[PDB]
Every structure is written in structure tokens, then in C-alpha cells.
Amino acid sequence: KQYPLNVPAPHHFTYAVRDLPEVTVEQRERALQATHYNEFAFPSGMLTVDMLSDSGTTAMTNHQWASLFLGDEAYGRNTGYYVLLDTFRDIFERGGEKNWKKIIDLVRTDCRDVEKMMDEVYLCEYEGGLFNGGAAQMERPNAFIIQQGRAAESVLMEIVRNILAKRHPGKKFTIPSNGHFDTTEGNIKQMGSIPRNLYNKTLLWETPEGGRYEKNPFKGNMDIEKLEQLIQGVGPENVPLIFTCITNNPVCGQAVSMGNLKEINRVAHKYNIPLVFDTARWAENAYFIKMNEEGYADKSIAEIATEMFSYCDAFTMSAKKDGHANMGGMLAFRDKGLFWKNFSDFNEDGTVKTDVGVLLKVKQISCYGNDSYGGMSGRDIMALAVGLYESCDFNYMNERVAQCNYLAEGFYDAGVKGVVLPAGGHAVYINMDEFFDGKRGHDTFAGEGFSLELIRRYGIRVSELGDYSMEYDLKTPEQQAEVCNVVRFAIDRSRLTKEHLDYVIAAVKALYEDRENIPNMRIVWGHNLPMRHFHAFLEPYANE
Amino acid sequence: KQYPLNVPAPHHFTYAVRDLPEVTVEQRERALQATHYNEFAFPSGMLTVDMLSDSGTTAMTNHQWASLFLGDEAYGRNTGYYVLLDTFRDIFERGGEKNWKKIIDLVRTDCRDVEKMMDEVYLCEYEGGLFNGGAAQMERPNAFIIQQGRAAESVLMEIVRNILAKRHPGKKFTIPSNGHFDTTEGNIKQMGSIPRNLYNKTLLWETPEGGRYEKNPFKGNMDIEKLEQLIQGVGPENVPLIFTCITNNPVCGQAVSMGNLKEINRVAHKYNIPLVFDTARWAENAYFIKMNEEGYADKSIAEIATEMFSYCDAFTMSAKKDGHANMGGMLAFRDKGLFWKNFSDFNEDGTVKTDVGVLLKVKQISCYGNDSYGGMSGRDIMALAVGLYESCDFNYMNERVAQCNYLAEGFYDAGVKGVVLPAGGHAVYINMDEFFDGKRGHDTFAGEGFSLELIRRYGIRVSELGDYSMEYDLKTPEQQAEVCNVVRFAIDRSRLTKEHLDYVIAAVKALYEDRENIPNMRIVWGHNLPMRHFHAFLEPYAN
Amino acid sequence: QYPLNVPAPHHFTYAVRDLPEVTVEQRERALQATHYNEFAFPSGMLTVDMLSDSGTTAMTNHQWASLFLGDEAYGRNTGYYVLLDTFRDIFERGGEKNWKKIIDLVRTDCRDVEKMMDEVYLCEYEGGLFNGGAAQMERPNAFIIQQGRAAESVLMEIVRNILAKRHPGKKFTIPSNGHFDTTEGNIKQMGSIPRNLYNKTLLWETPEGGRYEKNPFKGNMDIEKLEQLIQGVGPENVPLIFTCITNNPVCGQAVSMGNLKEINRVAHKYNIPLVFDTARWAENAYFIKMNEEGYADKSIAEIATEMFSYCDAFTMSAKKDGHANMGGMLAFRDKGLFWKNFSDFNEDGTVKTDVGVLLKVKQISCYGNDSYGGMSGRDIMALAVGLYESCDFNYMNERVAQCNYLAEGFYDAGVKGVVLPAGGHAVYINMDEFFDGKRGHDTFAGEGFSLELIRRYGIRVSELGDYSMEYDLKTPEQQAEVCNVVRFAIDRSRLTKEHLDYVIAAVKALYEDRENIPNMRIVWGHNLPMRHFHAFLEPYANE
Amino acid sequence: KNFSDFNEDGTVKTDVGVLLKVKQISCYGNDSYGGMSGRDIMALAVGLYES
Ligand SMILES: Cc1ncc(COP(=O)(O)O)c(/C=N/[C@@H](C[C@@]2(Cl)C(=O)Nc3ccccc32)C(=O)O)c1O
Ligand SMILES: Cc1ncc(COP(=O)(O)O)c(/C=N/[C@@H](C[C@@]2(Cl)C(=O)Nc3ccccc32)C(=O)O)c1O
Ligand SMILES: Cc1ncc(COP(=O)(O)O)c(/C=N/[C@@H](C[C@@]2(Cl)C(=O)Nc3ccccc32)C(=O)O)c1O
């Protein structure tokens, strides 16, 4: 029996609330100058809608809050370490809710059977996949809990550099990807390697009839020709790792398809090159696949998640995104997989001599913390495990992405030009070139003035992720052609509602209609710093 | 500098979230019949939008959740006892934020000066108002913490009934109000007393041009003429108390102006009749006064709240409403005021013989709990104190009532017949005589069939507060003329967003366009029970 | 007054957690299944876990209340300002009388935005350890980070890059009163040479009765040895001088203020920046206040500001004396000695490369934004509350009393090798005096002691002797500073006398059976950096 | 049996349970929570197992 309506039934409600401050325009002018016009230095408690980053900003579910009280703060082998690892196993290896072990439920039900705990939690042995356990994790470490994504990439990048520097001193390598985001690209350039972003920058800027594609075209896909012309061009022996980002955050958070991941796997393994996933927004990407890629409409997000991860030899993850949590990170690689083969040292008789996993662990434990908590508190570790399961839920993710489509189609319906469609899984992007109608030069940095104008006028903070923040003027010509000149409106998970989005639409429309009066922005300090958009001082000036 | 927009800035955001269930129509229909078609017995774990009641259903603020951990669970004199009493003093006696002592901040800042805590919290003396403190509260007790409003009313009504029985055995008294609710009225008929609702039932149904009153007309006001005509018709000696509800919950949660309060106070004290306020929705009312009544536009909720309460001799409050909380109640009377003079007994020389405040305290402690917690946990007492300060915040209350305005205008702009206007401060009401175009009877109980259809089809729960749940059939002809045949959509404080509201608007519009399909309901068990909507069994037949 | 021999209690249990019911055989199985690595043993199976006091604290109710005030914004969450200014209060403002406690504005829910800009967001501070506002942007000298090893690792990395693009090849020496295995491991992995300069003869001294009259401050750095090594190796080859308070390597032993002053003078004598590791500052301050002359009237907070005046830079693991489960901090004096030696300047004289900026680029690219530095927003708030709790004399006086009670319980029970007096966080036993000379350095019998505590009694402790400090992997000079002790670290606020009585009895029994404690053989990872977190062991009987 | 009233044929006329429920609901709270907060209910349920 059906009683349909032209509006959907909500699937969550506000469990607890938090008030927003009352701030004048004039007060936000004082704070802007007082902080050198750096978005990252503007006070949070002076804002009305904060869309700076979806990283760590989530509103937890009531079950996550409950779980804080189940966290274990012991220094060695706190119980959440086992629970976290087997939650990764559940979502990314087991394949389907019907296959989950959900040992988190032994902690949630206050199990007091020590024997059962031993046999199903503490002493379980796993080998052969992304997450060893028991003595196998001790003998062949391959999973590394850490505070966040950049810490996971940096522990990884350092090890790779050390090893490469020993085997090929003074040689620099090219590490391509579909989209290296500022953290990853900056940590790469800092290691000495050359990053490259291979995608179809042409499809990116097409917008569909009526404003809404009928199917999502997966604009985050890696161009497979470009990837193989790059490998044959510079030499495969010069390409030590291949990266893929899911979803593609640099390329306007656009989805990446399962067939695309299968191609990257083919090309990469063709040349014996380990393939590393950046999987911060794994669950948004799984959702786009289910909703758009033929054959995947009746598989679950948990199913698609395991399948996507079958194609990688390693991955880095900031769980502060689709962990639906406020902290967490993870680095893992296939047990005795392609990444472990190339980067370990072997004896003549075939036995391992230097395990890359041991080198990684040594760095983890000297720079971040014991492997059992990775620089997280015990309670954050339990809330993260719960949060990762929440991201598997269709109705939650359906509403999470419905919010992005609403903001983008709002920007469109209101006559804002240069709105990238469809929306990414976490954010809506605006092409600043089409926005100012090509009346500003790549060194105007007007996209930065647009962002500071949102703050000054409306208490809305966004993130310029184009020429200025991607360091257009400090890159090579090929890298310059790979820059998307876009401003980003990121949507915190579970924290905002239609009323926040309607106000942002109204305010963007107003700023559009007054775009001539948006200033340009001049760097007055830090123009050359690594990842300068976190450090540099700015100064506005009018256009001429 | 101003940068105007045609959309208001948001004033809060979601701190934490809870998921709603995935439920079929077949599943809800199965549960409706397993539970005899009583909406209070329907499992809330199966609802999509629950609008049964705003009482206790609030999403707390994060500062309230923090206060929980500051709660003191001791049996005698928990610190929360003092904090809560003095929070009542700040809001209802001290006249404005600038006059608040906010001793809750000594708890919040972990003050460890025993001397300072002694002088500013534990040992303070207060007398002469609604909340005695220290030795005064022991000698002349006049404030009683208790877990909710119906408990606050019951203690008062029992002690009033006992005093009236011993002094006037056999006399049946009349007690008027602008509107007594099902619990209040039911608790008064259970004494054997005659409750009466004196309001302008004609003003009530007036729909305004366009559906937007330029100013709130205060349809909750008591009819002063009708009040005098009742005091003189029954004789002052037969009116031992005068009640006044703010907002007027029974009369479509309609606003009550401050001039009205001044008048009721005058008429009452002309006859030496103590005036008791039901103040569950004080802060929504203070907002309506500020936004609509001449000369108060520049006054804060908190100022207006002190001024309202100055016109009363006692009050009962269910703090589960405008206390932004999930539990809490309060009963108080002015120290040595008119309520204490007419209900205490004195010696020949005029000193007190039997103190009515002691008679309520003995009842409080023997049936509810010690006067330092009154049936509440210690953490709930702290969270209540924080919550009552939050209800004074203009922007919070301005956005709370906006939701109700939004939902009623939604109903109107969709062409549903019977939307009372303006909306309540907590709920929107629909007149079911106007919904069905006069095509259903007072015994068809079509209002219950509507509320239950909302559940079956849409997983929306509402409260029929009309003929059935007000026992129109079990009332005197005089009282049947004051019965409002309306269904109520109550909005939980801070829990719902626009998304929830648009869904309800859509669902009601669809059911309005399917009026004839809404079955009738026939009570099959109960009917002659006090407050029978909370327990009666029901069954549907076609019209 | 009415004295009693029994002290009065100064805290109680706010909430409880149950412990597991486990058998010897279950524990023996888990030990074999986890290679006999004490860090791989499941905490879920333990009765009393004394592996580490770091991050294992039971928070106060006010800290738990704190968690709900944490701000999870990416850019400049409010907790960033509150935490910085808590460091200013405790470590720069010289006593409670001069604190600002801006955390109280958060805890009382300040909604006056101008007040918040002028007292929190836009404050300017320069000239000390914690710049604020544009100063902290222009000359960054404070860095929030998840824990101490991340702090020292960001220092030591930046120093290494400088000392190499300046003195290529050269290998420098970094003295300290006692570098911990974390600091030493990181120094050694940087290429430099750690060295710990203290009086090992004093350390083993016993007081007649097992109770000293005044703490002899055996963690003090040997003033003579320091100038001998600086003159020996040459000033230009000592780039930094560390100092640990309390001295964790040297049995968590207290360090006097006089000694900090002396180390200050010798260090500027040759223009060497002085760098304090202050993980356990509060207990060191408490040892000063009770033992040095003319400090008995000074409170913890005054002594903490004073101690900190003598450093040019500090690293801190707030997971210890911050009464918290996560948190670290790196800081240095604004335009101070450390900033002068390690920045690069123009001929004009302006800074050319600010060492502060280099540290910030590292922090931001490898840990997290400087506004949260890899911490969640609620852990920032709770850390700020916890640092204030560590200044309270009654807390810190019951905390250290649990160590005295444990060491003196061992002594009273005939156990031999108990270092004295107890440290501020733990009790240390010398394994040589324990086994009465009858075990060799290569026997690792201390690790057999620790593992046997697990097997029979569910007690986990840590070996910090010739196995974990890597005796056989060090120069002989380094080998003589190695302390052969097993540590009993006492979690802050988590345990009670009942737990200690049981560890006391369990150690007495296992001392009386020390003839039967196995020796430990490293089967794998004998050479790994910080091998006690990695290595595999196997038990073997003693011959 | 003792405190309810019964009809001639044998069936209940005045059920004592119903009388107790009317008093519960008019003086303390709905039977669903009886004057307790929702969270106090759940923590009580956990508490009783613990005992
Ligand atoms: C694909 C991908 N890979 C790795 C990481 C690092 O993970 P982690 O260490 O932070 O947890 C991220 C994190 N992205 C963030 C947060 C942050 Cl500073 C940032 O990192 N870049 C940036 C740009 C503009 C505003 C704010 C930010 C975001 O999307 O806004 C990522 O998107
Ligand atoms: C003005 C006023 N004064 C005192 C009290 C007593 O307070 P308390 O004991 O419950 O805390 C209340 C109670 N209000 C509730 C709950 C309840 Cl059963 C009811 O009483 N009437 C009603 C109508 C429809 C659905 C459910 C209900 C509510 O408004 O929905 C009140 O409205
Ligand atoms: C003076 C000083 N400087 C830096 C740090 C690092 O701080 P952080 O990064 O861990 O937060 C510490 C902390 N020491 C800890 C943690 C640790 Cl691994 C250890 O170092 N030795 C050991 C032995 C058994 C269990 C755990 C441990 C402790 O002894 O309890 C310190 O005392």
C-alpha cells in the first residue's frame, strides 16, 4: 500500500542543539583584518554558516556519543583497537552486511565472558588481506591506526622516500593520480617527487540540459590514456606508485566508477606498479556507483565498499570524513601484496630481510603513538568504529548527498554561472572564471575575495581551492593546466538543515549580482610557503 | 552596515542527530490494531514525525548536556536544589537579565570557595516573594519542586480540597479559568468541583484576511465580563480560586495579553479570591506580548516574565514545556500572600496555627520525594535550570514560534479547511467541524479517525483534543459550549527542522483531499473514565 | 579542631567500571599468543594495569562536562584559544590570583560577542612561551599536537635539518638529566648522541626506615658532569640541553628549583638553549613545594610559573600531569635564545627564516591544522580543564601519597631493591638488588618479573631496565647511566587503596619466589629502534 | 480478586488495575514513563542487571 507525497519522509532528527552567535558585519571586519584575511585564522564562534571543511566537523549520532563511554583508555591494547580493526574488515573485506561480524556489539552488550572475548576479539588471527590480526599483525604489520589522513600519507611518504633514496640516489619520481589534494600533493612535492592529476578537464565543465544530468557521468574518473602516455613517456621505472582518490576531491568531489578502478588496476599491475587509494570519501563514492553505474543498483554500500577496495594494494584514509567522526585515520596495505613485494628488502633465499611494514610501524610508534591507539583517545576510537557503520546506511547517505544536490541546483536555479554539476558527494563547487565572466586574471585572486566577502557580509566561510590555494603560479605548465579554479562550499555531515542551505543560496545570489564589487586579493606574506593557503597573509584591493 | 537577505539567518544547528526508522504502512496498520487504536499506546519507535505533545520531548542544548554531569545526586540539599530555586528567582522575580545572580555559574565554573558558596548559595535568606530561601523556606515553605505539572496541580488540589471539606462540608465549589486542560479540569472534576472556561469563542474562529493577523489578537484572554457574571451568579463565597493558563493551552494555545492579566488580578482581588496561574508556556506567552502588545516591544522575555508573575498569588508550572527540558515541575505561592491568608488557620491573637505551606510540603514528601529533589534526579535538576535560562533567549523563541507560524500558514496556503489562526506558541490546531464541512457528528469522532489516518499512512502522530478527548458527551451543556473540537499538531522544542514540517503539510493536504475516506471511530471500552483518551479502546467504521 | 590519625578523603568515585574475571591459564594462553610482549597483552584481561600513567587518567566530572563544550570547527575552534590561555595562566602568570580563566566564559555560555573578541579571539600576547593573535601568526612559537613524542619529534626534526644544512657530517651531543626511551630513541634516530647526567650513587641510597626526611631531589642533573662534557666535547658541539621534570628515566625522581637555576646558568654560560620536558611538571612542583626551603607557602601554580621561567623552550606530553587522555604541546620563548640560534637572519638584522614557521609547516602538513594539531575539539576542552585540576594541592597530595604508600608497602613487606623515595607517578624496583646479584645483564630477568606479574596476578608493569633501555645496544658510557628497574606506574585518579594492597601482596609473594622467575630471550627484533614496543620474547629457566 | 468488583455472571465490573492506572496517569505521569525521563528509564534497566 502506497500513500506517496511530493516531499520525502525525513530520516533523522535533531537529538541535541547548539546556538549560533549574533555578530554584526562590523565585528567581522575587525576579525578579518586582525587575522590577516586568512580564512583559517578567522574565529569559529563569529561565524553563521561554516563551510570551510567537511573534515572532522560531523555531528555524531546519539549512538556515537553513547560509545564514548565504552572507550578504553589503557595504554597497551585498548579494547577499541581490536574493534576498530575488525570494523575495517567488516566494511572493506567481508562484503555485505550479512557477512559482518560486528564485534563492536560485544562491547556494546557489556559481554563478561572472558573466553568468548579472547576467541572472537583479542586473539583472533587474520592474514592475507588489508588488516592482519593477532600474531600476524605482529609478524607482518600492515595496518596502522593514526590520527588522520595527512599523518597516514606522511608516514607512508617518508618510508617510500627513504627506500627510494637508498636504491636510486638523486633520481626523482613521478607519482600520478586522478586528483592529488593539497595535503597529498604538498607532502609529495616536499618528498622530492612530481605529482600529476590525470582526468578529463573537458567533461568537468559541461553542464547538463536543465541543470541535472540524468545519470552521474563520473567526472572524477582517471583518464586511462593520459595515465598510460605518462607511464610510457617518463618510464615505468620512474613511476614508483599510482594513486587514486575516491571520491575526487580536487576535481570538484566528482565520483569515480567501478570500471574506472578496474582499469587503473589493470594498467598499474601491467607495469608492476602498486596502486594506492586515497579513500577519505569512500562511502559517498560507493553511493554514486550504486545510484548510477549499470548493474550496481541492488548492491549495498557495504558491498560496493568491499569491491572498490579489492582493486587497491594499499590505501590511505582520513576517517574524519566518511568515518562520520571528529578524528581518525588509517594506513593499510595488502598482506604480502604488490606494495610489500617492491618496497621490502629480501634475502637471496627469498625470505624477507627488511619488512616495509616494520619500517612503517617504527615511524608510527616513534612519531605518533603506540600502534594500539595511533594518537587517538580511546573514546574517539570507539566513536569512529560506530561512525564507519553509520556511513554504510542507505537512508543516511541518500539524505547526505541530497543536501549537496539541493545547494547546487539552488545555485543554478538562482542564476549563478559556473556551478559545477553534478554536486560532489560532500560539497558544491563554483568555477570562478565563469563566475566573474572572465574579467579577472589568474593572479587577481578574486576567488579569495569572494570567500572573504561571504565571511564579511554573511558570516559564511568557504574554501578557495583554485589558482590561489593550488599554487597555480608556483607550478609547472602541465600542472597549471590541471588546476580547477573553483571555490568550494563543504557540507558538514548531519550538522546543517534546509534553513542553512536556503540562506547560503540567497547570499551567494546576492554576492553574484554584486560581483563587480568583490575585491582582488594580494599575497603580502608567504607566497612561496608549502601549502600556503594555511599560512599566508592577504590584503584586499578593488578591481580596475 | 547592513547586507539584507530575503531569507533569515539560522540561529542554531544540529549538535547531534538521531535516525528515524524505516516502516511500512502494513506495519503501522498492524501495530494500530495490536494497540486498540489508542494513539498513546502506539510505539514511538515506529513513528516518522511524532507530534503528540511538546511536553518533555525537547532536544536539549549541548550546554544542558554538560550540566547533567554537574548534577548532585545527594539525598539531602543537593547543590541543584539551590540553583534551581534561585533560577526561578532570576527569571520570575528579578526583572531582566541585568539583575540575574546566575549562581548556576558557580557550579559551572567549579567554584571551590566554601565560604563563598555558603554566603551566595546555601545559606541565603529570601522572603516576601514566590521563592523563600534558607530558614524562611523551612518556617514558611512556599515553593515545591516536583517532577511535573500534573503532580504540582494534584498536591495543590488535594490540600485545597481537604481545607474546603473540613471548613464547608458538602459545598460544591466552582473554579473558573480562561481554559482548563484535560489534566487540570479532570483533576478538578475528580475532586467534585465545577470547572468553567471563560473565553471569547467567537473571536477564536475568526479567520483573518489573507490568513495573517497584522497583530496577534490574544484569543486566549479571559472574558472579564463573563468572569464577573459567574462570580456574581454563583456568589463570591462559591469561588474559592481563580485559575489562568498562559498560554491558553485548551483554547488553541492562544496568547494571553498582560492587560488581561492585570484585569483578572483586579476582579479577583476585589473579592479576596487568590489567583493561580498555570504557567507551563510562560516564555511563548512573554514572546507574544513582546511582539504584539503596545509598549513592550523593547522588553526582554525575562522582564516580561517577571511582570506576568507579579499578577498572581500562586502558580503551577510543568517545566517539561517552556523549561527546554525533559522533566520538571513547580508549585509556588507568594510568601504570606492572599493564598496563604485564606487557606491557613490562625490563632486568636493572629499568629499562624496551621500553615498551608506545611500541609503541601507534607504531601510533597510523603507521595513524591524530599523537597530538595521532589522526584527528580540531580542531573535533571541542573539541566532544567540551564533550560529555563535558554527559554528567555529572544532568537531561540523567535525561531520556535516561527516553526508554528510556518506550519499553520502551510496548512492554510494548501487549502485545508479549519486551520485556527494564529498558530499557538507550541502547536497548530485544526477545527474538525470545518475540516469535514459539517458532514460528521459529535459521536462519529471523525477527529480520531483523522489523527489515526496520519499514523497509518504517514507515520505522523497527533492528538485529537476535541469532542472525544475532551469528553464533550460527558459534560454539562454549559461546558459543551466551551468544548473546542480541534486536532493538535504539537512541535517538540528544537527537535524538528523545515524538512519535517514540509512533510507534514504535504500529508495533511493529501488527507484533506481524501476527507470522505477518513473512517469514524467508536469507543468500545472506556468512555466514562477520568481523562479517558489516555486509556480508552477504539475501533474504526466507514462513514 | 578534632584531629584523627586517618586523613579525610578529598574525592570520591563519580562513576565505576567493572574489571574482568580471568584465570591464570587464560592469561598464560594470551601471553604465548602475543609473543610475550607486555604491550601486546590485551588490556581487557588485566586486573591492575600499571604499564603507563600516560593518557590512562580517570577524568573529573567537570572534564566530562567539558566534552560537550568542545568545538569541532576546522578553523580556530574556540578550544584553541582557551587551551593557549590556560598555558599562559599556569606557566606564565604566576599564581591563581592572576589567572584569567577564559575557560569560564565558555563554561558560562557567554553570548556577548564583543566581549569574546576582546577577551578571547583577538587578544594579543607576545614576549613569552605562548604568543596570541597576529603575533602567533607572525612569530609562531606555540604548537598544539596530540602527544609528547609528536612534540619532540617535530622539534628534533627541525633541528636536524638546520644542524645539517649548516654543519654537514657533524654528529652532536645532547645532554639531559634523563632522556626517556621516547626522547632517546628519537634523538638517536636523528643521528645525535643522547647522554644522561645524574648521580647514580645517590639514587640507590636508602634512608634508615625507608622514609627520607626531605626529598633528596635525586633526579637533579649533575652540575659537575654537565660542564665536564661541555668542555670535553666542546660548546659548539652541544646544540641543545634537555631537562626532564620529574626525571622519568631516573626513577621519576624530583628535581629542585635550585638545580633548574644552575642548569640555566651553565647553559647560557655557553649560549646553549635550555629545553624542558615537562610531562610531569605538577608533581615536580609539588615535590618542590613540600621539600625545598621557603617554598612551603608557594602553591603549585606559582612554582609552575617559576620553574618555567628557567627554560627557553619546552616539550610536554599533557597526557600525564594534564589529567587527560590525549594532548601535547611544543613551545619556545618569543625572540628568545632558541629562536636566535636556530633562525636565519638578514644582514639588516631582520629574521630571514623563522624557526617558528618551519615548525608550523611540519605541524600543519604531518599532524593537523595548528588550531587543533591532531586533537579533537572535545579533547582540547577537557585537557584545558585537566591542567587546572593538577594545580590543586589536595588532588596532587593524594596522588603522590599513593606512590609513597606503594613503595613503603613494598619496603614494609621485605621486598629488596625498592628505590626511594617514590616518584610522583610510579614506584621503581632495582632488579639487581631484587635478584641479589644472581642474574646477569643478558638474562632479562626483570622482563621475566613483569611477565610473571601478568601471568599469576593480572598485574601489568613495565620493564625500564637493561632490556627496554637497550643496554647491549649502547656505548659503555651510555651503558653506565642505564637504570635496571621495573616500574609500577599509577594511573591518575583511577585506583584506590584496595588496588595497591593487592599489588603489594602480589609482589611480596613473587619476591619470595624470585628463584622461580624465568629469564627472557629475545627471539626477534633485538636491534629495532625502541625495541621494547616491537620485540618477541620466550621464557627460559635460570641456571 | 479481593480488590476488584465483580459482576453476577463472573466477569470484572471494576478492575483494581484500572483504578491504579487512573491515579498513576492523573497524578504522576503517563504509564509509558511514570514521571521518569526517558534516559533515567534506560539507565535504570541497565542498573538492575548490574545488581
Ligand atoms: C583527499 C584528501 N586527502 C587527504 C586529506 C588530509 O586528511 P586530514 O589529515 O586532514 O585528516 C584531505 C583533507 N581535506 C580537508 C581538510 C584540509 Cl586542511 C585539507 O586537508 N586540505 C584542505 C583544503 C581546504 C580547506 C581545508 C583543508 C578538506 O577536505 O577540507 C583530503 O581531502
Ligand atoms: C497547560 C498544562 N498544564 C499542566 C500540564 C501538566 O503537566 P505534566 O504533568 O504533563 O508535565 C500540562 C500537560 N501537558 C501535556 C501532556 C498531556 Cl497527558 C496532558 O496533560 N494534556 C495533553 C493533551 C494532549 C496530549 C498529551 C497531553 C501536553 O501538553 O501535551 C499542560 O498542557
Ligand atoms: C619524559 C617523557 N618524554 C616524552 C614522553 C612521550 O610522551 P607521549 O608521546 O607518549 O605522550 C614521555 C612519556 N612516556 C610514557 C609513554 C611510553 Cl611509550 C614511554 O615513553 N615509555 C613507556 C613505558 C611503558 C608504557 C608506555 C611508555 C610513559 O612512560 O608512561 C615522557 O615520560
How would you portray this structure in words?
- The structure is cut from a larger assembly and holds four copies of chain A.
- Chain A has 544 residues and is an alpha/beta fold.
- Chain A has a domain of 260 residues: Type I PLP-dependent aspartate aminotransferase-like (Major domain) (Aspartate Aminotransferase, domain 2).
- Chain A contains 21 helices and 17 strands.
- In chain A, strands 3-9-8-7-6 form a five-stranded mixed beta sheet. In chain A, strands 12-15-14 form a three-stranded antiparallel beta sheet. A two-stranded parallel sheet of chain A has the order 2-13.
- In chain A, strand 6, helix 11 and strand 7 form a beta-alpha-beta unit.
- Chain A starts with 11 loop residues before the first strand and ends with a strand.
- Chains A and C meet through helix 1, helix 5, helix 7, helix 8 and helix 15 of A and helix 1, helix 5, helix 7, helix 8 and helix 15 of C.
- The complex binds ligand BY3 (3 copies).
- It is classed as lyase.
What's the short story on this structure?
The structure is cut from a larger assembly and holds four copies of chain A. The first copy, chain A, contains 21 helices and 17 strands.
Q: Under the CATH scheme, which architecture of the domain at 135-394 in chain A would be assigned?
A: 3-Layer(aba) Sandwich
CATH class of the domain at 135-394 in chain A: Alpha Beta
Distance between the termini of chain A: 64 Å
The most extensive contact between chains is:
A-C, 84 and 83 residues
| Quaternary class | part of a larger assembly
CATH topology of the domain at 135-394 in chain A: Aspartate Aminotransferase, domain 2
Our Rg estimate of chain A from Cα atoms comes to 23 Å
Major β-sheet annotation of chain A: 5 strands, mixed
